[PDB]
Structure formats: C-alpha cells, structure tokens
Amino acid sequence: APPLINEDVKRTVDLSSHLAKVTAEVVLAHLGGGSTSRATSFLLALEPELEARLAHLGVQVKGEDEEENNLEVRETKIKGKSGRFFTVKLPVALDPGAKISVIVETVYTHVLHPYPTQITQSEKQFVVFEGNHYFYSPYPTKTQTMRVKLASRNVESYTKLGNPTRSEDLLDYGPFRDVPAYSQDTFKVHYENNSPFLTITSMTRVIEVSHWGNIAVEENVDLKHTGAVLKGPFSRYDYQRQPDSGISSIRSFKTILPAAAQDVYYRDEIGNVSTSHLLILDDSVEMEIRPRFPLFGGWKTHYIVGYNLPSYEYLYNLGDQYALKMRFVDHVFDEQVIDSLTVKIILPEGAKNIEIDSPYEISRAPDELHYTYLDTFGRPVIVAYKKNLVEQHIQDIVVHYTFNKVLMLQEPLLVVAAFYILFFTVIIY
Amino acid sequence: VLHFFHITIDIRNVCVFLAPLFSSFTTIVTYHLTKELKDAGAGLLAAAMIA
Amino acid sequence: MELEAMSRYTSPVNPAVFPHLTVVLLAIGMFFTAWFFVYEVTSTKYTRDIYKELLISLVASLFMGFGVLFLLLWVGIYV
Amino acid sequence: FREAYYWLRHNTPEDAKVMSWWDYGYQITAMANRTILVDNNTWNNTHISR
Amino acid sequence: RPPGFDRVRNAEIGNKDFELDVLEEAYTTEHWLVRIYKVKDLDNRGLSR
Numbered sequence: 242a243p244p245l246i247n248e249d250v251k252r253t254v255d256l257s258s259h260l261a262k263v264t265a266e267v268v269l270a271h272l273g274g275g276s277t278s279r280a281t282s283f284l285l286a287l288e289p290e291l292e293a294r295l296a297h298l299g300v301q302v303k304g305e306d307e308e309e310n311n312l313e314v315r316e317t318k319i320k321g322k323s324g325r326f327f328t329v330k331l332p333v334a335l336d337p338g339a340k341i342s343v344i345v346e347t348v349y350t351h352v353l354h355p356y357p358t359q360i361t362q363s364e365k366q367f368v369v370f371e372g373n374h375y376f377y378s379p380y381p382t383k384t385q386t387m388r389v390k391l392a393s394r395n396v397e398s399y400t401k402l403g404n405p406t407r408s409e410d411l412l413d414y415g416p417f418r419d420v421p422a423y424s425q426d427t428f429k430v431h432y433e434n435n436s437p438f439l440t441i442t443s444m445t446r447v448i449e450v451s452h453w454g455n456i457a458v459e460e461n462v463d464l465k466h467t468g469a470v471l472k473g474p475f476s477r478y479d480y481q482r483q484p485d486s487g488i489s490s491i492r493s494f495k496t497i498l499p500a501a502a503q504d505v506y507y508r509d510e511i512g513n514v515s516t517s518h519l520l521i522l523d524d525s526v527e528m529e530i531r532p533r534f535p536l537f538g539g540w541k542t543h544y545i546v547g548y549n550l551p552s553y554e555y556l557y558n559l560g561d562q563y564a565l566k567m568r569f570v571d572h573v574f575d576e577q578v579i580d581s582l583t584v585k586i587i588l589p590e591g592a593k594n595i596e597i598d599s600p601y602e603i604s605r606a607p608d609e610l611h612y613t614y615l616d617t618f619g620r621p622v623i624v625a626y627k628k629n630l631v632e633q634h635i636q637d638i639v640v641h642y643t644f645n646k647v648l649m650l651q652e653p654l655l656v657v658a659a660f661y662i663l664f665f666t667v668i669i670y
Numbered sequence: 671v672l673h674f675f676h677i678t679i680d681i682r683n684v685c686v687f688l689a690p691l692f693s694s695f696t697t698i699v700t701y702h703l704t705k706e707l708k709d710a711g712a713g714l715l716a717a718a719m720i721a
Numbered sequence: 722m723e724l725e726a727m728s729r730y731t732s733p734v735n736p737a738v739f740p741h742l743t744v745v746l747l748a749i750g751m752f753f754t755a756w757f758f759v760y761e762v763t764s765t766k767y768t769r770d771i772y773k774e775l776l777i778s779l780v781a782s783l784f785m786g787f788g789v790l791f792l793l794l795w796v797g798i799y800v
Numbered sequence: 801f802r803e804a805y806y807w808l809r810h811n812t813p814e815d816a817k818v819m820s821w822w823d824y825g826y827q828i829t830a831m832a833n834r835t836i837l838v839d840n841n842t843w844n845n846t847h848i849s850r
Numbered sequence: 851r852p853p854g855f856d857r858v859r860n861a862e863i864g865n866k867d868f869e870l871d872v873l874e875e876a877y878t879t880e881h882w883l884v885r886i887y888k889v890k891d892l893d894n895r896g897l898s899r
C-alpha cells in the first residue's frame with residue numbers, strides 16, 4: 242500500500258455546549274515514490290475511548306465547491322488493528338509527491354460529565370472534558386496545533402503539557418512535532434459550563450399522507466434534563482425574585498417548524514398546554530414551547546406536537562406513480578440529541594410497490610397494517626428505527642408507490658350503503 | 671361498537687360527550703309520558719321545557 | 722422518476738369548494754328522508770307501493786351519504 | 801392544578817405516598833398516578849379523622 | 851397593601867417569619883395555588899428535631 246503522511250494538522254475543539262465538535266484540517270501528502278501506486282483513498286481512525294460516542298462523521302475537501310466536495314465515507318475494518326476505521330474515496334487519485342487538504346468533522350455525545358455531580362440552586366454548573374492532545378491517525382504527523390474553545394473563561398483546571406497559552410476562554414497547544422502514528426495523550430480540562438443540558442431520550446415521528454390534499458405529522462417527544470442533579474429544596478420565591486437563581490435551569494426552547502405547517506397544536510397526556518407562543522415567519526413557522534414546569538437536573542417531561550401540511554408542497558405524481566419527499570426529522574432545537582428515533586409513514590390503503598430511498602443507513606422493520614376511519618383493506622405502514630441521531634442528520638427522504646384512482650371512489654360507496662340499509666330495515670319491519 | 675366499525679375514537683371523547691346525547695333521549699321520553707297523562711299537545715310543551 | 726422530472730398532485734376538489742358542497746348535499750338528503758318517513762307513517766296496508774318507497778329511499782341515501790364525506794373533510798378528519 | 805399533578809407524575813418515586821384532604825383524592829390518583837391516603841368516597845370516617 | 855397581606859381573607863398575616871423543622875419545600879406553582887412539601891427523615895445523629 243502507498244505510504245501516506247499527515248504533513249500538517251490543525252485541530253479545533255469546541256466545548257461551548259453539551260456536544261463536542263471536532264474539526265481537523267489535514268494536508269495529506271504522498272510519501273511514496275513513483276514505484277508505489279497512486280493512492281485513491283486514505284484511512285481514518287477512531288480512538289477507542291471516543292469511538293462509542295461518535296454521533297456523526299463528515300469529510301469534505303477544502304474547496305469553494307463545498308456542496309460537491311463532500312466525500313463518500315464507508316465504515317471499514319483494517320485487519321490486526323483495534324478500533325473503528327473509515328475509508329474515504331478521494332475525488333481524484335493522489336499521485337506520488339502530491340498533497341491535498343481535507344476537512345474532517347466529528348461530533349461526540351455525552352463526553353461532558355458534570356463535576357460535582359450535585360449542585361444547589363445558587364451553585365453554578367461545572368463539567369469535565371477528556372480528549373486527546375494528538376491527532377490519532379495511522380500515519381505520522383509532521384506538526385500539529387490545537388485550539389480549544391471553552392464555554393466560559395472560568396476554567397478550574399487543565400493539563401499544561403506543552404506549556405499551552407491561555408487567553409480569555411481559549412486555549413492554545415503545540416506546535417507538536419514528529420508525532421508517531423497512533424499516539425495518545427489524555428487531555429483533561431475542568432471548567433464552568435452553563436449551557437442547556439437537554440437530552441431527548443426518545444422521539445416517535447408519525448407521518449400520515451392522505452389523498453385529499455393533506456399530510457398530518459405528529460411527534461411524541463420525551464425530554465430529560467441531563468445536567469448536574471439539583472440538591473436541596475426548590476424555592477419558588479427565590480426563583481422568581483432573583484435572576485441568578487437556578488441559572489443552569491432551562492425555561493424554554495424554540496422549534497423551527499415547516500413553513501407550510503397549519504393547525505399547530507401543543508398538548509400533553511393530561512390535556513392541552515396554553516403556554517406556547519407561535520410566530521409565523523416567511524421562511525418557517527417559529528414555535529416557542531415552554532414546559533409546564535422549569536426543568537432542573539434530573540427532571541423530565543413529556544409533550545406531543547402536531548401539524549398539517551398541504552399535499553402539493555411535498556407530494557409528486559406521474560400518473561399511477563406517486564413519490565413523496567419529506568424531511569426525515571423536525572428541527573426540534575439547536576444541538577438536539579436523540580437517543581432513539583422511530584419514523585412511521587402511513588400510506589393510503591391500496592398502495593402497491595412501496596419503495597424507500599433512505600438518505601443514509603436506517604433499520605427498517607416489517608411493514609404493519611393499520612385500520613383507521615373508513616379502512617377495510619388497511620393502510621400500509623412503513624417502520625424504521627435509528628439511534629444516536631444529531632442535528633446533522635436532518636436530511637431528505639423519498640418514498641415511491643403506485644395508486645389507482647378508482648380506490649378513492651370506493652370510500653363514498655361504503656358510507657352510502659350503511660344509510661341505505663337502515664331505510665330497507667324500516668320497510669321490512 | 672364504534673371501534674368494531676373501524677371508527678377509532680378516544681375513550682376520553684366518549685365519556686365527555688356521553689352526557690349531551692342522553693339529554694336528547696330524555697326529551698323523547700318526556701313527550702310520550704306527558705301524552706299518556708293528557709294529550710299530545712301537552713307532550714310537545716313538556717319536551718321544549720325539559721330541553 | 723424523480724420529483725423534479727415528474728409532476729405534482731392535488732385533490733381535484735379544491736378546499737374552498739367543500740363548504741358549499743356539504744350544505745347542498747345534506748339539504749337534498751334531508752328533504753327526501755323526511756318525505757320517506759311521513760309517507761310510511763301516513764300510508765296504510767292498501768295505500769303503500771313498494772316501488773315508490775324504494776325510489777325515495779335510494780335517492781335520499783345517495784345524496785346524504787356523499788354530503789357526509791364532505792362534512793368530514795370540512796371538519797378536518799381526513800379519511 | 802394540572803401542573804402540580806404532572807410534576808408529581810414524573811419527578812417523584814413511583815412508590816411515594818401523598819397526603820392531602822379528601823376533596824382531592826380522585827384528582828390526584830387519576831392524573832398524578834401516585835398513592836393517596838384519603839378519597840372522596842369517605843368509606844372510613846376514622847381514617848379521615850386521623 | 852403592605853407585604854405579607856392575604857388577599858382572599860383581606861387581612862395581613864400575624865406571623866411572618868418562621869422555619870419548618872420537619873418539612874422542606876419541594877415544589878410550588880407559579881401562582882402558589884398548589885404547594886408541595888416533603889417529609890424530612892429522622893435525624894442521623896439521633897438529636898431531637
């Protein structure tokens with residue numbers, strides 16, 4: 242295999258919120274001579290500690306054409322070496338002595354742990370982050386630097402390897418030189434973080450498309466606050482009187498709904514909720530949702546939101562063939578974390594040749610049959626599951642099926658018969 | 671019965687709207703009972719008052 | 722066979738139409754239904770004809786049954 | 801009234817016992833889903849008096 | 851009206867400052883309509899509470 246090296250690495254680590262975003266700009270170079278074959282692909286490696294927590298990985302070449310510079314990445318296992326690896330296909334083969342610059346972005350979940358575990362209403366929130374000083378790669382790195390951005394400038398402690406400079410809420414490390422491949426050094430920082438620690442433990446998204454010009458979507462959301470656990474009594478009087486009280490606590494969040502959303506309703510298991518404020522922007526329907534009570538560490542809540550959309554915005558037809566495009570998941574909030582998402586699509590009864598063009602990998606369960614108003618044959622249902630979804634996964638999906646006009650006319654006939662028979666019964670009696 | 675015919679309604683709705691429906695049934699019973707005592711004309715008056 | 726290449730679909734009946742159709746269809750169904758009951762109660766063993774009863778009942782059922790569907794859509798309980 | 805019941809529903813141990821006047825026994829059980837000591841039916845006078 | 855006034859009884863409370871030895875404030879509603887208190891456990895050291 243051709244010998245490749247990491248000529249330069251620049252790492253930016255963002256710890257402002259409950260998610261750790263990592264971006265590395267690497268100038269990959271080919272060290273092999275003419276005898277070696279041109280390298281069409283290169284390998285990426287995950288550290289064992291963080292591999293489980295990797296929500297998403299994206300690679301794009303450094304160029305103006307960012308939309309087209311995204312590279313196809315496939316999970317691969319390299320023999321004899323532990324840890325997850327990815328194979329990246331270059332746009333053009335890299336010949337001997339050439340170099341290219343690529344940008345790698347990874348997002349990790351749950352990597353910030355509250356320390357201390359428990360705080361009172363007055364006390365602030367502190368978190369611990371553990372990363373790596375060096376870029377963990379199969380290839381040696383000639384030189385590298387790191388820039389770390391903290392949520393707040395009040396950094397309690399950090400590792401001082403390499404005499405890192407500290408200015409304001411930013412840390413600078415390196416430049417390290419001649420780093421061997423696979424090198425690891427545990428970087429530890431403890432600092433104040435007050436960002437909203439919200440986790441969606443589970444969400445169920447139900448999409449129903451009806452041939453009468455309407456599609457209705459309902460999302461069931463379970464929300465838990467994963468910040469430092471509250472200790473001691475909760476003072477309503479203090480909370481109202483003082484702004485500082487419960488600073489970590491989350492009061493409200495805003496969801497960006499589809500522009501065409503209509504008849505938006507916000508409710509709970511025990512009835513309606515009147516606290517949500519709705520604003521209609523030209524591009525999107527902004528919805529402000531306030532939970533019934535403010536969420537402190539360890540508290541949880543449940544709510545259900547639903548809306549209707551016009552058919553012509555998203556539905557497409559070519560004679561008997563019908564194809565619908567839908568966004569996979571709603572933008573519930575910025576930096577949203579979803580442990581488990583289940584998506585169900587209910588097509589009209591009599592649909593045939595159902596096919597789904599998934600944007601990315603998703604487990605698909607056997608299709609169910611559903612009965613609702615006017616259903617005798619039953620409506621076909623598509624079922625899918627996924628875990629550890631993040632904001633980057635708000636892609637588009639398309640479903641294709643065949644339907645016939647006569648089936649719509651069937652619906653009136655069933656209704657008419659029931660009334661007519663009642664008249665007949667009177668005549669017989 | 672409603673579910674049997676594939677009309678899926680929440681149990682909560684059934685309880686909430688159970689009471690108004692019976693009021694209409696009560697109206698019919700009132701007219702017949704009044705009619706027995708005196709006449710149809712009284713029964714129509716009773717149904718209006720009870721409603 | 723992609724969305725851009727292909728066409729788009731909407732219900733043939735436009736939303737604005739629904740209020741008018743529901744009112745008209747139900748009214749026609751109601752008139753025949755009242756006629757059927759009054760005829761049956763007034764009629765006697767020698768005054769009733771099966772043919773007349775069937776025609777009125779069938780017409781009443783057809784008009785009202787379609788009207789009900791428009792009512793459900795107008796309310797928003799899409800089938 | 802509902803807001804308090806919802807708070808109890810998710811933020812307390814399932815086995816917790818809640819004490820209140822008998823007027824609210826039915827409402828708490830239906831929505832809070834938590835055990836109560838007294839109820840509207842008031843089948844036991846001595847229990848209420850205690 | 852002066853602080854600590856009770857609107858429904860139209861009177862001001864006589865006893866304004868006191869502490870709960872055996873009860874702690876768990877949750878209070880926004881308008882204070884419903885107040886929830888948690889029962890304190892026994893004393894770890896066995897002191898009389």
Ligand SMILES: *[C@@H]1O[C@H](CO)[C@@H](O[C@@H]2O[C@H](CO)[C@@H](O[C@@H]3O[C@H](CO[C@H]4O[C@H](CO[C@H]5O[C@H](CO)[C@@H](O)[C@H](O)[C@@H]5O)[C@@H](O)[C@H](O[C@H]5O[C@H](CO)[C@@H](O)[C@H](O)[C@@H]5O)[C@@H]4O)[C@@H](O)[C@H](O[C@H]4O[C@H](CO)[C@@H](O)[C@H](O)[C@@H]4O[C@H]4O[C@H](CO)[C@@H](O)[C@H](O)[C@@H]4O)[C@@H]3O)[C@H](O)[C@H]2NC(C)=O)[C@H](O)[C@H]1NC(C)=O
Nearest residue numbers: 504505506507508513514515516517518519520521528529
């Ligand atoms: C079942 O539950 C559901 C769901 O809860 C219930 O329906 C919901 O009912 C609530 C009731 O309040 C409705 O709330 C409405 O929300 C919108 C959106 O509010 C946000 O945007 C506003 C837009 O402001 C823009 O412009 C200003 C500058 O002008 C900027 O500052 C803003 O940034 C925006 O650019 C904004 O004003 C709002 O801010 C307010 O709230 C925030 C906190 O949320 C505060 O910080 C702000 O200071 C401020 O208080 C907010 O960001 C509002 O626009 C609606 O306000 C109208 O209606 C109010 C009454 O509901 C009324 O008090 C307002 O004055 C205003 O009045 C409107 O109508 C009047 C005529 O009646 C007009 O005179 C007036 O001009 C205006 O048109 C409102 O608060 C939810 O929309 C609604 N949700 C859904 C999905 O329908 C349902 O009722 C429940 N059923 C029951 C109980 O039976």
Ligand SMILES: *[C@@H]1O[C@H](CO)[C@@H](O[C@@H]2O[C@H](CO)[C@@H](O)[C@H](O)[C@H]2NC(C)=O)[C@H](O)[C@H]1NC(C)=O
Nearest residue numbers: 510809810813814815829830831832833834835
């Ligand atoms: C109300 O509380 C009861 C009491 O626990 C809940 O019953 C539990 O239900 C879960 C889910 O089915 C079971 O795993 C538990 O074993 C049940 N516990 C007992 C003691 O029966 C019930 O789910 C709650 N009601 C809800 C959530 O609507």
